[PDB]
Amino acid sequence: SFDKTTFRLLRGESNLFYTLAKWENNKLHVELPESPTMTLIYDENGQLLWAQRDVPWLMKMIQPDWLKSNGFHEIEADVNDTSLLLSGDHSIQQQLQEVREDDDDAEMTHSVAVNVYPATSRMPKLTIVVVRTIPVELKS
């Protein structure tokens, strides 16, 4: 599409996350800001420091090379796996049921923004991955 708009929106979200991050006692303390996204924070070697939610299939899609540079990505997911990004929203769960009944094999697209922050006097090198949980095909 025109990926730059979505990339920039996700990146603003990520920049906020970085600003509110603190590092103390060899440990990263994250605070949430205040559409829906899932944020994942990796250290300077691609190891997971923190995650908004535990979702292994998503963890597998974040290709580790992505984490060395700022970038936009799409990931395709099975609609039943997209559901596990959106759990708690009965409405989108029903849109997903409609998708699933139209086709068991349905796939879904997810916008992803990887952002890299070199080390500072107070904070190690970090990489914030912001993933849009509502898939592209449903935008509304």
Curated annotation (Swiss-Prot):
Changing R8D: Large decrease in the transcriptional activation of PhoQ-dependent genes. Changing D102A: Wild-type effect concerning mgrB transcription. Changing D105F: Wild-type effect concerning mgrB transcription. Changing T6Y: Higher activity than wild-type (with or without MgCl(2) or CaCl(2)). Induction: The phoP/phoQ operon is positively autoregulated by both PhoP and PhoQ in a Mg(2+)-dependent manner, inhibited at high Mg(2+) concentrations. Induced by dsbA disruption and dithiothreitol. A divalent metal cation binds at D104, D105. Changing T5L: No significant effect (with or without MgCl(2) or CaCl(2)). It comes from the Bacteria. Residues 1-140 are periplasmic. Changing T6 to A/C/E/M/N/Q/S/V: No significant effect (with or without MgCl(2) or CaCl(2)). It is found in: Cell inner membrane. Homodimer; probably dimerizes via the cytoplasmic domain. Probably interacts with MgrB in the periplasm, altering its activity and that of downstream effector PhoP. Member of the two-component regulatory system PhoP/PhoQ involved in adaptation to low Mg(2+) environments and the control of acid resistance genes. In low periplasmic Mg(2+), PhoQ functions as a membrane-associated protein kinase that undergoes autophosphorylation and subsequently transfers the phosphate to PhoP, resulting in the expression of PhoP-activated genes (PAG) and repression of PhoP-repressed genes (PRG). In high periplasmic Mg(2+), acts as a protein phosphatase that dephosphorylates phospho-PhoP, resulting in the repression of PAG and may lead to expression of some PRG. There is a close linkage between the PhoP/PhoQ and Rcs signaling systems, and both signaling systems respond to certain external divalent cations (zinc and magnesium). Two-component regulatory system EvgA/EvgS interacts with PhoP/PhoQ via signal transduction mediated by phospho-EvgA. This is Sensor protein PhoQ. It comes from Escherichia coli (strain K12).
